[PDB]
Scaffold this active site. Structure first.
Site, PDB file in Angstrom:
ATOM      1  N   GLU A  22      -8.338  12.187   5.628  1.00 38.26           N
ATOM      2  CA  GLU A  22      -8.442  11.987   4.171  1.00 38.26           C
ATOM      3  C   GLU A  22      -9.291  13.066   3.467  1.00 38.26           C
ATOM      4  OE1 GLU A  22      -9.724   8.007   3.228  1.00 38.26           O
ATOM      5  OE2 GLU A  22      -7.828   6.897   3.603  1.00 38.26           O
ATOM      6  N   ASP A  31     -11.052  11.497  -9.078  1.00 38.18           N
ATOM      7  CA  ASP A  31      -9.893  11.182  -8.265  1.00 38.18           C
ATOM      8  C   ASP A  31      -8.639  11.170  -9.118  1.00 38.18           C
ATOM      9  OD1 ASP A  31      -9.943   8.786  -9.704  1.00 38.18           O
ATOM     10  OD2 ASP A  31     -10.545   7.553  -8.013  1.00 38.18           O
TER      11      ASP A  31
END
Ligand SMILES: CCCCN1CCC(N(Cc2ccccc2)C(=O)Nc2ccc(Cl)c(Cl)c2)CC1
Length: 360
Positions: A22, A31
């Site tokens: 990730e 994000d």
């Protein structure tokens, strides 16, 4: 929370696993949903205020971080998140018996899945979960590979499945080695911490791209490269991770997808603004005019209808705000410049350009 309390564990662990799958970010960033995050997907706040996010982070780390943390600090935040994920697994009637039955490595694989897809997603794998509980590893691996999960993130999913199949960290050891050996093809022989110009040229040659192409700048943008002059080891590893690539062939296949992102909302503006910092000499606050002209011609040709007149004007240093505002000017300006607002606090350079360009 001291990592010393974990020294009896293996050096490979769930944090290292998720760092490969990730990725790890050491500075606060936004994000997908636009929320301030750091580390391995640790959400700091939903507040639009970066200062708020920094306060939460300084609070969690116990020092004035200024929005930047070390890898060890990121591991501490991550281990708190793992502990919460495990607590949830242990309250889930479908997942607890599987988790309890698994060895430590395979538990990490299950936690990895929960991070990616949540408990409900993982619980949906009914036959595979039963197979895991019964230690039918090869069957579990076969079934997991037929899933939508596999189609979404095939490289990550293959590593997690291999970890279930084998109960070892081999897939992660192999990935790290593959990336290290790829990086070593490009690294500066006199500075292992970066790829220099000769290595970037080799990288472009391997991708069959002209260094002066917009594709190369798009790659730099996706790798979040700090400067045109070098390509750091951290940048290379973080980008190959984020792009889900462990080979040049996979990276080449990803380039068209990067190019397509420029059509999504606000992404071209992000790319355009990125270009300024990337192009500029790090020791300077502003961008040399000649370099600004080169990059403007690369990124705005076919987008800014007055680019040719802009060139003529300039051939008779650029701060960030002036760079940024040229795109806004390009977006709003009428084909005949008749709608320019001289009281719009545009840079003097643009006011002067409009005065120059109308007679033409
Ligand atoms: C508008 C005309 C610009 C011309 N040049 C400016 C330098 C560019 N450059 C350095 C570099 C790369 C290959 C060969 C010689 C020099 C880079 O772009 N570096 C760079 C640095 C980091 C990354 Cl990740 C990437 Cl993909 C590239 C390439 C284009």
């Amino acid at each position: 929370q001291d990592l010393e309390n974990l020294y009896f564990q293996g050096s490979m662990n769930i944090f290292e696993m998720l760092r490969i799958d990730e990725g790890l970010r050491l500075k606060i960033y936004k994000d997908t949903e636009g929320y301030y995050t750091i580390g391995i997907g640790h959400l700091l706040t939903k507040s639009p205020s970066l200062n708020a996010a920094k306060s939460e982070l300084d609070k969690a780390i116990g020092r004035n971080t200024n929005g930047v943390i070390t890898k060890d600090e990121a591991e501490k935040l991550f281990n708190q998140d793992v502990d919460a994920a495990v607590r949830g697994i242990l309250r889930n009637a479908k997942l607890k018996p599987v988790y309890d039955s698994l060895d430590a490595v395979r538990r990490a694989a299950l936690i990895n899945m929960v991070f990616q897809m949540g408990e409900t997603g993982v619980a949906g794998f009914t036959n595979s979960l039963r197979m895991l509980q019964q230690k039918r590893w090869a069957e579990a691996a076969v079934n997991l590979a037929k899933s939508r999960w596999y189609n979404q993130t095939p490289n990550r999913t293959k590593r997690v499945i291999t970890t279930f199949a084998t109960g070892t960290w081999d897939a992660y050891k192999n990935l790290r080695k593959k990336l290290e050996q790829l990086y070593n093809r490009y690294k500066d022989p006199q500075d292992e911490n970066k790829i220099g110009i000769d290595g970037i040229q080799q990288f472009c040659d391997d991708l069959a791209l002209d260094p002066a192409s917009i594709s190369v700048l798009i790659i730099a943008w996706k790798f979040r490269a700090a400067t045109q002059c070098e390509f750091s080891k951290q940048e290379f590893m973080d980008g190959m991770t984020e792009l889900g690539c462990d080979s040049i062939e996979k990276l080449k296949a990803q380039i068209p997808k990067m190019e397509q992102e420029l059509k999504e909302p606000g992404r071209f503006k992000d790319f355009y603004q990125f270009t300024f910092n990337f192009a500029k000499n790090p020791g300077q606050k502003g961008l040399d005019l000649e370099m600004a002209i080169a990059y403007w011609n690369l990124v705005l040709n076919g987008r800014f209808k007055f680019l040719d007149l802009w060139n003529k004007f300039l051939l008779e240093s650029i701060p960030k705000d002036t760079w940024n505002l040229l795109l806004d000017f390009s977006t709003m300006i009428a084909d005949d410049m008749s709608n320019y607002d001289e009281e719009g606090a545009w840079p003097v350079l643009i006011d002067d350009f409009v005065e120059f360009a109308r007679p033409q």
